[PDB]
Design an enzyme around this catalytic site. Structure first.
Site, PDB file in Angstrom:
ATOM      1  N   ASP A 273       0.845  -1.175   0.000  1.00  0.00           N
ATOM      2  CA  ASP A 273       0.000   0.000   0.000  1.00  0.00           C
ATOM      3  C   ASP A 273       0.891   1.240   0.000  1.00  0.00           C
ATOM      4  OD1 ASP A 273      -3.017   1.004   0.583  1.00  0.00           O
ATOM      5  OD2 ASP A 273      -1.572   2.202   1.736  1.00  0.00           O
TER       6      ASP A 273
ATOM      7  N   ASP B 198       0.380   4.444   0.988  1.00  0.00           N
ATOM      8  CA  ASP B 198       0.429   5.455   2.054  1.00  0.00           C
ATOM      9  C   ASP B 198       0.079   4.959   3.445  1.00  0.00           C
ATOM     10  OD1 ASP B 198      -2.308   5.048   1.868  1.00  0.00           O
ATOM     11  OD2 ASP B 198      -2.842   7.016   1.167  1.00  0.00           O
TER      12      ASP B 198
ATOM     13  N   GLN C  72      -2.626   3.852   4.678  1.00  0.00           N
ATOM     14  CA  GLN C  72      -4.049   4.061   4.900  1.00  0.00           C
ATOM     15  C   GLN C  72      -4.862   3.040   4.112  1.00  0.00           C
ATOM     16  OE1 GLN C  72      -3.932   8.746   6.079  1.00  0.00           O
ATOM     17  NE2 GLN C  72      -5.333   8.092   4.450  1.00  0.00           N
TER      18      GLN C  72
ATOM     19  N   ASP D 175     -14.650 -15.001  14.461  1.00  0.00           N
ATOM     20  CA  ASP D 175     -14.750 -16.446  14.719  1.00  0.00           C
ATOM     21  C   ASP D 175     -14.315 -17.264  13.510  1.00  0.00           C
ATOM     22  OD1 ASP D 175     -17.063 -15.692  13.230  1.00  0.00           O
ATOM     23  OD2 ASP D 175     -18.460 -16.493  14.686  1.00  0.00           O
TER      24      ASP D 175
ATOM     25  N   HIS E  77     -11.279 -19.691  13.681  1.00  0.00           N
ATOM     26  CA  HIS E  77     -11.579 -21.077  13.287  1.00  0.00           C
ATOM     27  C   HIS E  77     -10.474 -21.608  12.383  1.00  0.00           C
ATOM     28  CE1 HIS E  77     -14.629 -24.284  11.852  1.00  0.00           C
ATOM     29  NE2 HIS E  77     -13.746 -24.329  10.866  1.00  0.00           N
ATOM     30  N   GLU E  78     -10.147 -20.780  11.389  1.00  0.00           N
ATOM     31  CA  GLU E  78      -9.141 -21.194  10.414  1.00  0.00           C
ATOM     32  C   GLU E  78      -7.773 -21.343  11.077  1.00  0.00           C
ATOM     33  OE1 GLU E  78     -10.494 -22.322   7.982  1.00  0.00           O
ATOM     34  OE2 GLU E  78     -12.297 -21.094   7.820  1.00  0.00           O
TER      35      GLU E  78
ATOM     36  N   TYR F 295      -9.280 -35.382   8.836  1.00  0.00           N
ATOM     37  CA  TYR F 295     -10.456 -34.580   8.475  1.00  0.00           C
ATOM     38  C   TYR F 295     -11.548 -35.426   7.857  1.00  0.00           C
ATOM     39  CZ  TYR F 295     -12.669 -30.074   7.606  1.00  0.00           C
ATOM     40  OH  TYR F 295     -13.505 -28.974   7.692  1.00  0.00           O
TER      41      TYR F 295
ATOM     42  N   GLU G  44     -13.650 -15.016  19.857  1.00  0.00           N
ATOM     43  CA  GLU G  44     -14.623 -13.913  19.719  1.00  0.00           C
ATOM     44  C   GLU G  44     -14.963 -13.289  21.065  1.00  0.00           C
ATOM     45  OE1 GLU G  44     -17.740 -14.547  16.694  1.00  0.00           O
ATOM     46  OE2 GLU G  44     -19.161 -13.831  18.251  1.00  0.00           O
TER      47      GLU G  44
ATOM     48  N   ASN H 266     -19.595  -7.954  20.533  1.00  0.00           N
ATOM     49  CA  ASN H 266     -20.784  -8.723  20.180  1.00  0.00           C
ATOM     50  C   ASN H 266     -20.558 -10.229  20.234  1.00  0.00           C
ATOM     51  OD1 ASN H 266     -22.071  -6.265  19.579  1.00  0.00           O
ATOM     52  ND2 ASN H 266     -20.995  -6.220  17.599  1.00  0.00           N
TER      53      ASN H 266
ATOM     54  N   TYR I 180     -22.250 -13.792   7.291  1.00  0.00           N
ATOM     55  CA  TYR I 180     -23.231 -14.626   6.613  1.00  0.00           C
ATOM     56  C   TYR I 180     -24.515 -13.874   6.255  1.00  0.00           C
ATOM     57  CZ  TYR I 180     -25.904 -18.915   5.782  1.00  0.00           C
ATOM     58  OH  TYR I 180     -26.691 -19.912   5.241  1.00  0.00           O
TER      59      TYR I 180
ATOM     60  N   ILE J 149     -30.105 -11.178   5.534  1.00  0.00           N
ATOM     61  CA  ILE J 149     -30.948 -11.810   6.557  1.00  0.00           C
ATOM     62  C   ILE J 149     -30.409 -11.570   7.954  1.00  0.00           C
ATOM     63  CG2 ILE J 149     -31.846 -14.005   7.389  1.00  0.00           C
ATOM     64  CD1 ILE J 149     -31.476 -15.096   4.478  1.00  0.00           C
TER      65      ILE J 149
ATOM     66  N   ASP K 249     -19.669 -34.210   2.700  1.00  0.00           N
ATOM     67  CA  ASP K 249     -18.938 -33.366   3.653  1.00  0.00           C
ATOM     68  C   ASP K 249     -17.913 -34.157   4.442  1.00  0.00           C
ATOM     69  OD1 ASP K 249     -18.403 -30.986   5.177  1.00  0.00           O
ATOM     70  OD2 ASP K 249     -19.871 -31.535   6.658  1.00  0.00           O
TER      71      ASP K 249
ATOM     72  N   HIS L  20     -18.874 -31.010   9.133  1.00  0.00           N
ATOM     73  CA  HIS L  20     -19.467 -29.738   9.520  1.00  0.00           C
ATOM     74  C   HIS L  20     -20.884 -29.900  10.095  1.00  0.00           C
ATOM     75  CE1 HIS L  20     -16.419 -28.164   6.593  1.00  0.00           C
ATOM     76  NE2 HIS L  20     -16.344 -27.213   7.510  1.00  0.00           N
TER      77      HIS L  20
HETATM   78  C1  LIG Z   1     -15.615 -20.986   9.617  1.00  0.00           C
HETATM   79  C2  LIG Z   1     -15.801 -22.027   8.554  1.00  0.00           C
HETATM   80  O1  LIG Z   1     -16.355 -23.114   8.690  1.00  0.00           O
HETATM   81  O2  LIG Z   1     -15.257 -21.770   7.350  1.00  0.00           O
HETATM   82  C3  LIG Z   1     -15.517 -22.642   6.313  1.00  0.00           C
HETATM   83  C4  LIG Z   1     -16.377 -22.166   5.307  1.00  0.00           C
HETATM   84  C5  LIG Z   1     -16.952 -20.755   5.429  1.00  0.00           C
HETATM   85  C6  LIG Z   1     -16.680 -22.997   4.225  1.00  0.00           C
HETATM   86  C7  LIG Z   1     -16.139 -24.285   4.150  1.00  0.00           C
HETATM   87  C8  LIG Z   1     -15.280 -24.759   5.158  1.00  0.00           C
HETATM   88  C9  LIG Z   1     -14.977 -23.921   6.235  1.00  0.00           C
HETATM   89  C10 LIG Z   1     -14.010 -24.488   7.350  1.00  0.00           C
HETATM   90  O3  LIG Z   1     -13.158 -23.628   7.852  1.00  0.00           O
HETATM   91  O4  LIG Z   1     -14.222 -25.726   7.658  1.00  0.00           O
HETATM   92 CA   LIG Z   2     -27.150 -12.855   7.996  1.00  0.00          CA
HETATM   93 CA   LIG Z   3     -19.830 -15.827  16.441  1.00  0.00          CA
HETATM   94 CA   LIG Z   4      -3.720   3.259   0.847  1.00  0.00          CA
HETATM   95 CA   LIG Z   5     -20.703 -12.193  17.192  1.00  0.00          CA
HETATM   96 ZN   LIG Z   6     -13.225 -25.701   9.581  1.00  0.00          ZN
END
Ligand SMILES: CC(=O)Oc1c(C)cccc1C(=O)O
Ligand SMILES: [Ca+2]
Ligand SMILES: [Ca+2]
Ligand SMILES: [Ca+2]
Ligand SMILES: [Ca+2]
Ligand SMILES: [Zn+2]
EC number: 3.4.24.27
Length: 316
Positions: free
Chosen positions: A57, A59, A61, A138, A142-143, A157, A177, A183, A193, A197, A226, A231
């Site tokens: 980047d 500057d 910012q 989160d 998570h990742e 997995y 979180e 929040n 997400y 909604i 899956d 999941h």
């Molecule tokens: C937070 C989370 O589950 O992230 C994912 C998403 C949004 C799609 C597919 C897999 C994953 C994962 O990290 O397992």
């Molecule tokens: Ca939403």
């Molecule tokens: Ca959350």
């Molecule tokens: Ca910039």
């Molecule tokens: Ca939250």
């Molecule tokens: Zn995951």
């Protein structure tokens, strides 16, 4: 890159202003030298070659719309680093301050985020099902927790070990979180997400069935989708973790809650000292009981609550 540490300012996906640690060397890069061996954020530029370019980047910012996913990936990776170091005395995901790398703007309209074995990867979302996924602390945590798991228990997995792998990531993503304390909730992904909604999420730990995920072993999915429901069957363990922390009565079984911090200590110990690549749910139960026994004593409320919780979700 070699350069001098600086502090940039920008706005994240949700339009919130935050400071970010950068490095200057002709350009300002998203490279935070203040944590471990560095936190590095990359631009994948809507393609799928990784990691892409270290974010540069002119500057220092970062308020363009294009910058926002990078700002949040970078910032929330630092928050997650802080959580593991301050709360569990763990230095980055490998315990030895490995550099943390993230790429944003991955692909086009990509509704996912993941850990590819070496780095975190965030899609921008198609703007309908998701906005850029790094906007969810989160999700980021998570990742990064997937990397922690891969360096520790190594949960394969698929099937039950894979559902534990997923729940571990939902559990610590949620605990991060709350750590950040903006929040906080027991839902996953609500900040990014379905922008049209309100009040929904990807998954719920407090009530997994709200989105079709099992909240009891008797309702476990055993098909092949899956990765054998990683999941999906994660809701059985997510519900158990929620109950350990918050308490409740579930299918007639009462659990005395012991709070988020003790939940985090017990599951962190299980993850790093007792679970193995092939652990199943029953083995996770034994690991959490042994962990709670190590931490609080065989006769503790804490051991009792772990047992009640796994009882409540039908895992013996
Ligand atoms: C937070 C989370 O589950 O992230 C994912 C998403 C949004 C799609 C597919 C897999 C994953 C994962 O990290 O397992
Ligand atoms: Ca939403
Ligand atoms: Ca959350
Ligand atoms: Ca910039
Ligand atoms: Ca939250
Ligand atoms: Zn995951």
């Amino acid at each position: 890159i070699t350069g001098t540490s600086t502090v940039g300012v920008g706005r994240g996906v949700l339009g919130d202003q935050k400071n970010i640690n950068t490095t200057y060397s002709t350009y300002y890069y998203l490279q935070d030298n203040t944590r471990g061996d560095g936190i590095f954020t990359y631009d994948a530029k809507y393609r799928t070659t990784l990691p892409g370019s270290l974010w540069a980047d002119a500057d220092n910012q970062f308020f363009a719309s294009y910058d926002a996913p990078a700002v949040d990936a970078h910032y929330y990776a630092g928050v997650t680093y802080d959580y593991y170091k301050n709360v569990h005395n763990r230095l980055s995901y490998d315990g030895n301050n490995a550099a943390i790398r993230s790429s944003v703007h991955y692909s086009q309209g990509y509704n996912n985020a993941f850990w590819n074995g070496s780095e975190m990867v965030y899609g921008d979302g198609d703007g309908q099902t998701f906005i850029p996924l790094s906007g969810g602390i989160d999700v980021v945590a998570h990742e990064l927790t997937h990397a922690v798991t891969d360096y520790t228990a190594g949960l394969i997995y698929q099937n039950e070990s894979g559902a534990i792998n997923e729940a571990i990531s939902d559990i610590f993503g949620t605990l991060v979180e709350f750590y950040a304390n903006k929040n906080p909730d027991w839902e996953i992904g609500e900040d990014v997400y379905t922008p049209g909604i309100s009040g929904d999420s990807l998954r719920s730990m407090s009530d997994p069935a709200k989105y079709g995920d099992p909240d009891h072993y008797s309702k476990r999915y055993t098909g092949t989708q899956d990765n054998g429901g990683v999941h999906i069957n994660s809701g059985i363990i997510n519900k158990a973790a929620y109950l350990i922390s918050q308490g409740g009565t579930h299918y007639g079984v009462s659990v005395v809650g012991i709070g988020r911090d003790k939940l985090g200590k017990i599951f962190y110990r299980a993850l790093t000292q007792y679970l193995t690549p092939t652990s199943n749910f029953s083995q996770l139960r034994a690991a959490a009981v042994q962990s709670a026994t190590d931490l609080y004593g065989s006769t503790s409320q804490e051991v009792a609550s772990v047992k009640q919780a796994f009882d409540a979700v039908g895992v013996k």
